[model samples]
Target: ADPLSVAADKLAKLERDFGGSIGVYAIDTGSGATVANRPNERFPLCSSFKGFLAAGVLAQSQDKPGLLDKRIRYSKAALPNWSPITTKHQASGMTVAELNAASVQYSDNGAANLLLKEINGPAALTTFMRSIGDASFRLDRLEPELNSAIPRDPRDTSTPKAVAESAQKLALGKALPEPQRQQLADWLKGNTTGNARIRAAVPAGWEVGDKTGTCGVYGTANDFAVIWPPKRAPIVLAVYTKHAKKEAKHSDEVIAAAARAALEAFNVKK
Candidate 1:
């Protein structure tokens, strides 16, 4: 951090301007080192945790190759505007890759539930988190009625540092062997969603493969993503924000500001 206080001050100001508690971490993939604000000050991961689910699919499917082709039937219960998997088809199905795409790209609720079902239930999801060395990042067993189960709290949470590390693994191919890393990255790319703060900051036409989650009512706005092609600067960034009330205007702006701050922090060329 030597000779970087000026950049750090700018980053600190951006967080304050966002008008919320913010945690962010960026890491270099090649060297596997932190640029700034690493281990992430602990923040709720929200849907960013879905990336781990992607990893689970990759890891398990490698051992059970047939798992990718299993078909899942959707019922009337799956039909809802907000459902990740919908009743658009009275009984429609998708391959593992398709489910992964729908859940991540569109933030489909029913689809995610279906994929989770196929991927060995919520307990399995917790197990997968542990497999990734994220024991502290686990969530309750996702009940079949998770849609209606009043969540007394958030579904996904993690320290900012852990979140960054996870993203770095995806970028660095550290989650598994190189083949599996590429497979997971391909899935993540296919499942990208355009909603949420972080995506909003990404420049147009730039490809950022990530999953986003937002529930402002509980002061939740989180995004975890691997910026593609490696910038030789920061390879991964995990953002977490919380506030008493909605900061709609500030939310998008904050992430955008972070982009600028990131460029500065990394001493990137204009």
Candidate 2:
């Protein structure tokens, strides 16, 4: 059977079982083969936008050597939903490097905002996306406002194709300098959350580094990652769910099912 056919079939089956609209994008970096469904369609990014923000910071650091070391202080007013640092460090002072670690590794909302501020808000990232050849991608607001329920904006979104391309760039070392790219990769690999999404059902001996996003009130869940099989080129994947139930587990299962199928498809030899 064909790899594309197999990927499509498994994806359709997953959509049937998962019970919501889903967008998927997966690519074999070495072969340039891709499998995508509604890859260009916009979906809520939630915290997944942090990846782009991190990239923005890295891009700027190339021009300013000590940019990452700049000190930033946090207070309770800066705290946003799901911020763990506030509970542990409690409005403490830290550097941009520490904030990026918390933002990427722990999906810390407060830390994300700090980085966004450092990068001069969402407009900077919007320009960064276009510079990277993702003109269709949009970044309208920072994490706290974007995650807020008070004023929801459709402009704060990303597509499966855009996200997959971002991951692919990172995995291929096309996104940042060697040191900075490795730094971002390390943060993603250390991600302790979203175990039930892209990281779930991973094949033996394969490693996955990913970021997950969830919004129970908005009924969305998403994951983007670079999966490394022992002997194959990296597989870049992006999965997004929309209009899901308020409970996040269902959306997470949808992402897991699609990821498992994509992995199997990639593992099959010609």
Candidate 3:
């Protein structure tokens, strides 16, 4: 059987077992083996958009030297829930690289917002995606707007395929110079916030670098990863869950289960 077909079957079964809708996209970085379940379907990114934001930060730095090293200050009132800048960093000042690390590795909403502003907001972010030849990845709003007194727009979304493709491009160093690409990957590899999602069921000794996003009140959970095994080629995967309950741990569990199934399928074919 085709590896992608086998993986998709397992993903669909796991989604059924988990009792919610899931969209999955996976690609082998070497052989280009791929799989998808609702690949084009749009889902709330929650905070997963920070991965792309990190890319934007690096992309801009290519032209503006030391952009990553530049420092910025923040206040407690500016941060959102679950922000490390508020909890660990005490809402103090930090450099751009520090903010990017917090945003990607910690999923810090405040740090992500600060980077968004540095990259010149949603308009520039969309342009950056287009420059990289991606049209399906959409980031329409910032994090704080989701909970503001202003009406929330449902368009802050991305497809599983798009997220997976973005990860693949970054991993392959496409459209980015080597140094920045490595920097982005280093930040992702250090990620500690996605333990419950893709890393939840990965086998021992397999290295996983990933970003996670959640909207507990709105039923959204997402993870995008680059999985590396000691022998096999790197695997890029994105799993998104929607229509779940508030603070749904099941969503994260489903992603882990489906990712495990997909990885097993890859190993079986190898």
Candidate 4:
């Protein structure tokens, strides 16, 4: 049996349990093995786009030395509801690097919007995605607004395969120049929100960095991770979910379950 089909078969049951759709894409960077289920389906990126938003900022800094150092100060009106980091630094403002950290690690909406503003907003980030050879990632709105997660609408979305591949490039040094790549990876490693999602599926003593997204309006949520298994090649994974109800809430249980299944697709000999 094909591994992807087998994985897809396993994932189908979980999707029904979730009362929603689940999409997964994963690759062994060293072995080139992959497993996918509904990999091309577009799902709302939610806060997941902030990871690439930081990457987009770093991309801008590649040529413009001052881009990351530029200061950004915003009024109370500008801060989004869940800006724990940004709200604290209201008067002094934060540098582009600081905002990138807040956005990546905390999913701080204000930090993301400010960084988005610095990089000239959604389409600009989309341009950076195109440069990285990804045709599926598109950011059409900023934080909170993008959290709408309409079922069939195609705004602020990315395919699981596209996200996994692009994240692999970013983590492995193709998409970003040098320290900037490490910068984003480090921030994602420190992410505060994804502890119970993909990170929950990983074994102890292995290193993993991940970013997550949760769209409150719909049962849409996702996480992407770069994981280093002991003495083996790093793994890149993207998992996304969306339920067909306005009142539905995203489920951490399903994401972790799907991730566990994706790992099983590899059938580790150890």
Candidate 5:
């Protein structure tokens, strides 16, 4: 009769249906306790790696409170397909704040690469990840060119397990100084992605902050989110799908189903 087992079963079925996998963790915000976890496995973060930039930004904000004012400019290079930054509209620009929103909210590739450059260039991204306890994460550093001729990639990846831990740290205000931590929390609220998964499962106005990652890769849809489970308690969640030969859109459906099941598993009253 335990909800956790039921949730796990549901997650397992979700993986089977999409021919992918998911790892999730829901925490009780008030007490900072883990309420439920399904799979909770470790897998590459994919675009979710950009979330770390948010973290690095917060760290930077502590020293330079207005760092978000740094304006993003376009460069002559091939942008990732998912990027909203347009070569056609090369003159357009976004501030670090706007770029952050574009990166998380829309999963905008151009914004992500730009923010990646801002956070610490491609090389420093890994250093930041290691500082946050994600030694395994490695962006490729060199790959297909992103705008501004920034050619770096760990392939830009992380594991759900690591992401969950980082999320927890962010939720607890342990990842950055008080001011910066609050700033990151506020920024994540404006994120455009991961809404479907958190909203589908959690109650309305639960204050879920999340980021989603999708690309042309085979059948992978990666998303990592942090839910403020209760008004005061925070939890970490990272869902990933390496779906077999399926349409890209199916990744959303698979993740949504698992998230709803997790809410039920956690026994949230609402």
Candidate 6:
């Protein structure tokens, strides 16, 4: 294997310069090539889990025709401070589809908890991941609690490779039937929280959809995406980062830099 390249140097330099540890995995599905840097190591999922959560909900919807249209109301207390989309629509409530969209697109914590309840909580989502062949993804708690993001805590975490693989399966593999898979992709494409991460690294004409996570403490934050380069099978990647100290802040540019290296590994230019 070729070990020397400009990309590798940047990746190495990135790990040295960034205060937090970075975990990244990217697969050029068309060529079957991979770039792994701390790929199997655990990183807090934070809100990134909502991406898989929405997919799990879609998997369930295949069997329940009425699932998406069901209107459910919640008390004001169900709202979390970060729930902009959910908070605005709390009075009349929302449909399953609306909540799913909010959770993935806006990283709405309150909407995430409600969707978790509808799908039978964190373990059920874990089961869904398992069903799709991921051994490293586990959502052990609901929102707010999950976002606490204690460094090195195993309660809510997934490996970058595992998340990348699952994103590939859901986005372009056989994990879901055509409609639901497309719907999930549409939701990810509309995600409002990831502009500075992976999406910022890819070329403008490429079709890219992503989900982002930000746990205000522990310097934890992440982004995962399925990017479609023209005339090629999609590239799926995940970048997870965590600083040792709670007060340290997360970095979006770090993630974009990691993504650039991954794309360069695939011969894809920015």
Backbone atom clashes (below 3 Å) for every candidate? 12, 0, 0, 0, 15, 0
lDDT of 6 by residue, 1-270 (tens): 463266667777887788778888988888798888888999999999999999998999999998989997997775877889888998899999999889998898899999999999999999999998999999998888887788778989999999999999997888999998999999998988888999999988787889999988888999999998887788898999888888988889999998988888887777
User: Where is model 5 poorest over a 10-residue stretch in terms of lDDT?
Assistant: 143-152
How does each model score on TM-score?
Answer: 0.81, 0.90, 0.89, 0.95, 0.82, 0.96
Alpha carbon lDDT of each predicted model: 0.60, 0.77, 0.78, 0.88, 0.64, 0.89
Q: Which candidate has the highest TM-score of all?
A: 6
lDDT of 1 by residue, 203-249 (tens): 55445666665544435566776766444433676766665454342
| lDDT tens per residue, model 5, 1-270 | 777678778877877777665667565555555534434444445567667777777677778867888776777375766766444444766678777766667677777777777776877777877787766666654222311111122355555666777777764557788776776777677776676655566677787777776644546666677777454455566776664443534367777776777666555643
C-alpha RMSD of each candidate structure in angstroms: 3.8, 2.8, 3.1, 1.7, 4.4, 1.4
Pairing residues by index, what is the TM-score of model 3?
A: 0.89
**Candidate 3, 23-119: lDDT as tens digits:** 8888877788777788988777778888889999999999999998898877776677778653566545889999989999988888888898899
Which regions of candidate 5 fall more than 4 Å away from where they truly are?
31-41, 76-78, 85-92, 141-155, 229-232, 244-249
Q: In candidate 2, how many Å is residue 73 off?
A: 1.1
Using lDDT as the measure, name the better of candidate 4 and candidate 5.
4
2 versus 6: better lDDT goes to:
6
Give me candidate 1's TM-score against the actual structure. Answer: 0.81
Candidates ranked by lDDT, best first?
A: 6, 4, 3, 2, 5, 1
Look at candidate 6 and give me any clashing residue pairs.
none
Candidate 4, residue 66: lDDT: 83
1-270: candidate 4 lDDT, tens digit per residue:
976677788899998888999999999878799998888999999999998888898888988988888888788676778999999998898999889888988899999998888889899999989988999999999789999998899999999999999999897656797788888788888888888898888887677889999998678999999987887888999999998899998999899889988987776421
lDDT of 5: 0.64
Q: What lDDT tens digits, residue by residue, belong to model 2 across residues 13-118?
A: 7777766568899888878888888798888787888877888898899999998898886677657788886446654677888888888878998888888888
